[PDB]
């Protein structure tokens, strides 16, 4: 999206003032790809000193 | 106009270079030696409060 | 064991000169003057041993 005044004036008469807004959608790329993995081992012996 | 731009989204790629590393066998040799000489080294520290 | 892979980048904006018509007369109005945002990454990969 992207708005603008296309205040346009008349010819050589009266001269009045005038804003006319529109807008128009813009492109744009793609955003990032957040990535967050992660991997272990399960579990092989639950001894607490070896 | 009013244009309004994002910065998630006008950035190039992410490089090549983003893969993971290469390591030899010498220089895995050479790692473990100097973290055994560390830790055997460092041992002698703990015994000097006797 | 362990291997890390450490990233990091910047990004600044660089806009061009100005925008020439062909026989009307242009302006800008505002602008960053400035940077804009920092991407960074970061890899581990460790295998213990007994």
Redesign the interface.
Known sequence: ????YYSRKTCGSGGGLSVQRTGYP?T?????KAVNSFERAPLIVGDHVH | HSREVDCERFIGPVPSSFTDPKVTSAQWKFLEDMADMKALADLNKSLVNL | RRTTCELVGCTRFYPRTVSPPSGWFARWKDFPDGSLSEVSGLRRTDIRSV
């Open positions: 999206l992207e708005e603008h813009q744009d790329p793609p955003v990032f």
